[PDB]
Symmetry: D2
Subunit: 258 residues, 4 copies
């Protein structure tokens, strides 16, 4: 079966729309969940622990590692879900904007996976199927878009870092699987902000036409709900996914395949 | 949760190496399983029903439809798992060899999905997430190989048919998801026959060298076990995969991503 | 330099929209061109020879081989450009319609490449870069579409057959490169017939709305012209492409990459 | 397929591939402005050679100033400058990722922004548009152990190419943008990668590393730097007028098996 019995999971961005659904789904599969987000206080349904955590801060990652080390002595699953977007005209975008999107979307995975690597190696010894690192990319890491250069570039970087770490951790015998997840248009405040900013830049006549165009681009014919991301993350974190590493795990309503 | 409560599933090739593991995994998730294969009888563990079934025969598919119609009135999940391989020197391969591999690997999906479409539409009304059609492709439908022209070509056809049917069934409002599955090197009699035939053609010095080369090409560093395919198929057939259609669902130990 | 000095080229479908532009482009690069199509005679500008040729006929292919053998003793470039499309509702599509599209789009490449293999091996000895086989796939071989199941399936099969033949001809030491070409929406009678048939099915409100939607799906913002296919085919047929085999050569105005 | 009246800027012009790109583009009649870190180079076919750090905005502005004064446009911009490292992820400081990003990706961002006015003039000069050619890698398509920093940067190059192609078309600039994906090409960079792979103990020896890499290419050998030139000429030409956002692969079949 697909379950997370005795899985110690760290989930970042845990107070956001997708993050809360990931924590509920992982708890329903019996995971022990350390939830983290920018808010100093949060009631995340299904979290065993909540920590205030800026994923750009090595000190913040060390605090997460210290709690997991003291309470459990391993991390079995690490879900890099924290992320940002910007929507900009390339020619008006300072290099510092590219760097800021890279720092939150990519450096978070580099710093967090380095800080938690000792604990993930313990995860690799605890389960035959291995520890599991799940990196949130996007359909924007597979397919480009006008006015999303900084965001898409960062999500393609997340996708490829996932392939390289899955290959390297296997070659070094660590028994850590690494996969990228590629959501399509999910109904969250982030998608709302992207469509509003697209209208402000004059990429779309109105927010209504922007939303309709985005929906029609998905063969399934609608935005995804945050809860539609949970089962895929549970699967990847589970021993049922023991032969799944370096993979692009797509949950996009068919967006990328047409 | 990821489960198949009240899911009526048809699984073809159910007596083979992967097929038997799929039926056990789907039963363990509470599916009602109609198992079919070429043998006139079979003890398939976890099958509610076994039918003798040639997937190239429209009459055979109608007998499957008749049983599901009488007992259940719907099909919630259809797993096209029946398949064949050949390994041949292209210049020695008659057109009839391409056609034979096409008839089993591709025409099976066309004929079976057409015959079961009324029952799949009833599945689409039974579950908010939709009925689910799962087509077995291969990493050979993503990446080519010397001496596997007929097989790889058929598996690329399976992959693309899956994208087109997912898009079309969504456009027509049928609520039927369609996805392709891409196994890597799985330890089954089919992979054994491919490596033996590669030696017979003189593509590999010996079965031992063929096997080692194939293992080293997978970043995870080994062949898959047939049971490692079950979780992925359960996920795709479940309501947890409600935003997953037209997708390439890869279970390949990283083979395609390096 | 990119040129086709002393290149003996066979181009099928040579009387069609793209075919005529391929023959002109290849002649402009100094190729010797054997042009073939269904019509019993034709004035194909830049053709050294015209033959009536049904690409589904082994006897037709042997007549092409006989002319090249007598006049030149080799074939340096083979461009499989002959192709057909249908636009259908899957559930109303008889298996024979899938088979008809397969016979013209895929079996043509199998039969023709087998019959011309001895002459292509002579091409492999004539140029260090090798003989060059160019197979016309489609963006429909990369991305699926509603109501194009038979066409897209055949074009994905063309794509994968190209990868397998490139790998096999290299492994056998024949020095024959094989590549697939993937046009986007090109202004030809075939695209016209697809958009008209889409209206007849009621997939599109009108031919005007169908055309506008198709144009806006291309990032470059317009249909391609048939002449925009010629340079890419010249490049692939040339010694400049000596390190290009098994490749997807895309000329789609960005369609597949968004 | 020719580059008559094409003003081309080629970065990393003194390297293995760069020297062959300049020769190929000159042979197709381009005017070539060649740039690299070196104050001199055995670059033949360059109309102008500039010492140029592609990480420096000031360096790019000096390139723009020369093209503006001599020609008033840039028709083709080939981002070929690049570095690699080979490291164990757990031992790789964030600054190493940032250094590879600065040379491999920030170069394209800074250079394309600084040259955008001149590229818009190229967009008015040719029906097919100005052409920006970004050097990615098969490592931007497929991952590899011990190449996390390098492959990550090349996947970033690939996706930036798709976004800029889409954006410049949406804004009506008539600038095509494409990524190029070389396989294992016989250059000092591939040599450095294979040597460092041995030092980390990824390969028994340089000889075994090289043989494994050759056998991974269906064509059965490394590429020569000259085998990259025709593809870049094609993408820079009016013959490629319907080619934008594309992955232009020259890899001996590496990525497709
Ligand atoms: N296809 C798409 O464009 C698309 C759409 C939606 C979501 N996504 C993906 O889903 C993931 C979740 O996004 P979401 O839609 O829930 O957006 P969201 O803004 O609702 O949640 C993202 C979370 O990340 C947190 N976060 C941001 N910066 C942080 C930092 N420095 N430290 C710690 N936490 C930080 C935010 O507080 C927020 O809780 C993203 O990583 C993204 O890859 C992609
Ligand atoms: N990497 C790969 O290429 C790879 C590896 C393993 C499996 N697969 C795919 O997974 C699927 C399962 O294969 P497997 O490894 O279990 O092979 P298998 O031979 O063990 O099982 C295949 C089953 O299909 C049945 N079958 C064959 N022709 C049939 C017909 N005309 N009608 C009904 N049943 C028929 C066989 O009797 C057999 O039981 C196949 O589609 C196969 O192509 C692919
Ligand atoms: N995006 C796309 O899907 C797309 C768009 C345009 C073209 N294409 C492909 O490019 C190629 C060129 O097509 P086109 O647009 O010029 O169409 P076209 O109809 O103008 O030309 C196709 C030619 O093939 C010939 N042909 C058909 N059946 C034949 C047979 N049995 N024997 C010999 N010749 C035969 C026809 O006579 C015709 O001259 C085709 O393979 C097509 O599939 C794809
Ligand atoms: N498959 C692959 O990974 C692969 C193989 C070969 C080349 N490539 C890519 O092709 C391109 C050509 O590289 P090459 O193989 O000729 O390597 P090379 O080292 O021979 O040449 C690269 C050139 O770029 C120059 N350069 C480096 N940093 C610079 C800076 N800050 N400013 C200006 N110039 C700088 C170097 O001096 C060098 O001359 C690179 O982008 C490389 O990554 C990729």
């Amino acid at each position: 079966t697909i379950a997370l019995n005795n899985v110690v999971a760290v989930v970042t961005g845990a107070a956001g729309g997708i993050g809360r659904e990931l924590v509920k789904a992982m708890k329903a599969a019996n995971a022990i969940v350390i939830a983290t987000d920018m808010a100093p206080s949060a009631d995340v349904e299904g979290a065993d622990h909540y920590l205030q955590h800026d994923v750009t801060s090595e000190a913040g990652w060390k605090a997460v590692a210290a709690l997991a080390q003291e309470k459990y002595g391993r991390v079995d699953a690490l879900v890099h879900n924290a992320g940002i977007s910007i929507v900009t005209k390339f020619e008006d975008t300072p290099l510092s904007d590219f760097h800021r999107v890279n720092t939150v979307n990519v450096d978070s995975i580099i710093i967090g996976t380095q800080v938690l690597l000792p604990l993930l190696k313990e995860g690799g010894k605890a389960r035959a199927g291995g520890a599991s690192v799940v990196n949130f990319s996007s359909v924007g890491g597979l397919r480009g878009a006008a006015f999303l250069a900084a965001y898409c570039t960062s999500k393609a970087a997340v996708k490829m870092l996932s392939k390289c770490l899955g290959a390297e951790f296997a070659a070094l015998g660590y028994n850590i699987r690494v996969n990228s997840v590629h959501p399509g248009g999910i109904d969250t405040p982030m998608l709302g902000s992207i469509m509003d900013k697209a209208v402000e830049l004059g990429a779309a006549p109105s927010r209504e036409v922007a939303q309709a165009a985005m929906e029609m681009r998905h063969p399934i014919g609608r935005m995804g709900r945050p809860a539609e991301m949970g089962g895929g993350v549970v699967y990847l974190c589970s021993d049922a996914a023991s032969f799944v590493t370096c993979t692009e795990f797509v949950m996009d309503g068919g967006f990328s395949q047409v």
